[model samples]
Target: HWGYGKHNGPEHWHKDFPIAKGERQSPVDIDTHTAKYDPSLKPLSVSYDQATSLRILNNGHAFNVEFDDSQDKAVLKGGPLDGTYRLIQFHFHWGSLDGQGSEHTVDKKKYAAELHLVHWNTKYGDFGKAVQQPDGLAVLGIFLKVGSAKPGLQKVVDVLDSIKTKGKSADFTNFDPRGLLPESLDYWTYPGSLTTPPLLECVTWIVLKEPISVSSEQVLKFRKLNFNGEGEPEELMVDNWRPAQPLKNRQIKASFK
Candidate 1:
């Protein structure tokens, strides 16, 4: 259910489970020109303390990281997103190589990759249980574009040498993920489901229009990850991204001026 491998590829997920057919999916191509505009939505200020807990994990499928939920204290007190929600995990979806990485598609055009920051409402007690509820989750989506080396993502690539092979992983000590967040926090919000299996429809999505840049080499390195477990001696899984699904009458909302 978790890592990626030849036997565990996204295409094979629904064979044993039918829920994989769920209509709401993520990593869709974002066309800013077509999105409806609004001025009130802007970047919410996040402090350094809240930024430091950003941690990454090698879950066998892709390199995933966790955001500091404690930082929510400063912004979510009583705003439109007012509630106690803690960041549980963040992960990436990419193609087998450099050119085909996104999980969701828009009108059939796919991006290089997509990053997901998952959060759960404290009202539900814990993420494991909340993931089953219809309104227990929130996710922020950022698109990835192939370009010159990106300064914001240098820290991530810095740790690649340590986890370059399948199942090979190292804790990214003394690093903060917030530094990698896109400059434009202005985002599009919508009601959606988990992109992966169980395909749960419990997420409030905030897909950012602006994307962060990653070097072509960094992306190539990411695609080389092994789908085999950390315990396995040899790596098997190569590609870890899911194909895009139908939009199904959903309206994506944005906060922009």
Candidate 2:
């Protein structure tokens, strides 16, 4: 019932998740004109030891690469965050059609997809515990546009066949997700959330200004995965993005002019 099907979509999430009505909920639309450029915003300070990539899993929502966050191996500091943040996992949101995925959009336009790198503040203890506090989480958002193939994505893309169904996982490592980011660290930051169930309002969003490129052929690879597991009616694993939520009374702070 919690699936992204027509009947169990975003509109119904409020029933299963009470915080769905929260003011700072995520996947909001960005209007550059309204967003204020803040000189106080510092450049993003990030360090990723790609070796921390433990494995990848198809949680039926999206494909996620879980990292070993036991220590400060892969960290996200600065960029709207008060203290250090440890990388927990990185996942994506996509659609079957073009210009129809990404949870957050710029200038009211949607991209092909979105990549989310989730992190938790060490001061608040574990991620699950940190998630309950206002300044507990930090998530970086990267929009994806289809063009030439992304060399960094080859390893992740090649394994699509193995994780075609739900409840599937595979060994994955030796790849730096930062390699998939744009050259510029310019970004738009705000306070948002998990974008799904519980719709927690703890994540400090850091959306990259420039999008990375993928290939049309690579986009097709995502469609091959199915939302259903064994013995269930087949359903294409696409359009897994959440629609934009109301912004309420928040401000979008831009790190660039």
Candidate 3:
């Protein structure tokens, strides 16, 4: 029942999930002035050549593209993580309009959307066991700016019509998510939790500094998606993002100047 509605939205989430008020929550506003530059931080590394992308699903909360993570075929290394993290799935959080959608902000400025590439540490055996550990997950967050259309994103948007309703899915095999990333890999690293429910405190967030482009028309396509299931009253899926949480004692380390 947790949704972006008047009664079940982020504000009411704390009542049902106590960890919602946890010390290390995600989507914190990254104040560039305050974030410390870490010379020790390594450049982010990602390998998706063998990533066996599966299906695209409208999971009510947001639409996600799932990937095969049975092995370490597609992995994320360096930056904030000590071990390799296997790519599992990637999803987006967006607003109803262009001005406000991204979960993470740069210097308090919001982007049109945010992309989260979720991964699990291989040392933890599997995603299930990894989700329970502090360093179990590593999520790459990429900001989406409204401008030119991204060819990679267009490929994804073109398939939205078939899976417009919640729970709807279609086969989307062999898609390489690497095509969606910005050219620059510079990023900010921090310890945080998932932006959604369970709000597990296990993710080491790696947020990219540069944003990928998405045309205004292309973004409008997502609005056609319904949070409601087939045969249910139509409720457009939008504003599926959590507000920035308090920074607490967390130290945000930047890989760039």
Candidate 4:
């Protein structure tokens, strides 16, 4: 029932999910100067099997490409994480207009879009159990800048037409997420929550420093996605990102100096 509109949006999420105002809420402005550079941080290790990609679903919030995370087929390790994390799903957040929609901002600048690769720690056994635990989830954030043709994302761009409406899903296979990442694994890490419902405060955020390329036309093509299914008044599925939350007492650490 929670939707991003005039009435049931992020501003009103606290009324339903009290955790919205919780200390560790996500999508914060990363102050580069203030972020401490920890030399001890290891390079990010991500291994995602293309065949593990199962289906892509428009969950009315974001389009997510889910993987068969039942085993350690695809795992994320190192880079401020203590244990192995299994890949569960990957999604994106963006807006109708340019330079306005990324969930997390750096130095107060929001990008055209943002990508999230959601993972759960193997220590918790499964995603469901990990949601409530402290050391449960670790999410990788990659920013998307509006620009030229992204052949790396052509496969994903080709499928937007089939899932224009909410609840619509299609089998998405053999898409290696590695092609979506930037060359530099330089990042900032902190504690944060899910940008959406339940607003769980169990995520260890690893936000990459560099952004990947996406085109202006490709950016607007995302607007074709509808927030509602069939009968409801179709609303543009844009600006789905949550506003930057208070940093509270958390300190952000950078992997590079």
If scored against the real structure, what TM-score would every candidate get? 0.80, 0.97, 0.99, 0.97
Per-residue lDDT of model 3, residues 1-257, tens digit only? 89999989999999988999999999899999999999998778899889999999999999999999988899999987898999999999998989999999999999999999999999998999999999999999999999999998877999999999988999999798988999999999999999999899999999999999999988999878999999999999999999999999899999998
Better of 2 and 3 by lDDT: 3
lDDT of each: 0.65, 0.88, 0.93, 0.90
- Candidate No. with top lDDT: 3
Q: With candidate 4 superimposed using the best TM-score fit, by how many Å does residue 207's alpha carbon deviate from the native?
A: 0.3
Residues 14-50, candidate 2, lDDT per residue (tens digit)?
Answer: 9989889998999899999999999998779988854
**What is the lDDT ranking, best to worst?**
3, 4, 2, 1
Q: How far is candidate 3 from the true structure (C-alpha RMSD, Å)?
A: 0.7
Residue pairs that clash (backbone atoms under 3 angstroms), model 2: 95-239
Worst 10 residues of 1 by lDDT: 73-82
lDDT of 2 at 191: 87
Give the worst 10-residue stretch by lDDT in candidate 3: 40-49
Candidate 4, 231: how far from true, in Å?
A: 3.0
Rate residue 225 of model 3 by lDDT.
90
The better-scoring model by lDDT among 3 and 4 is: 3
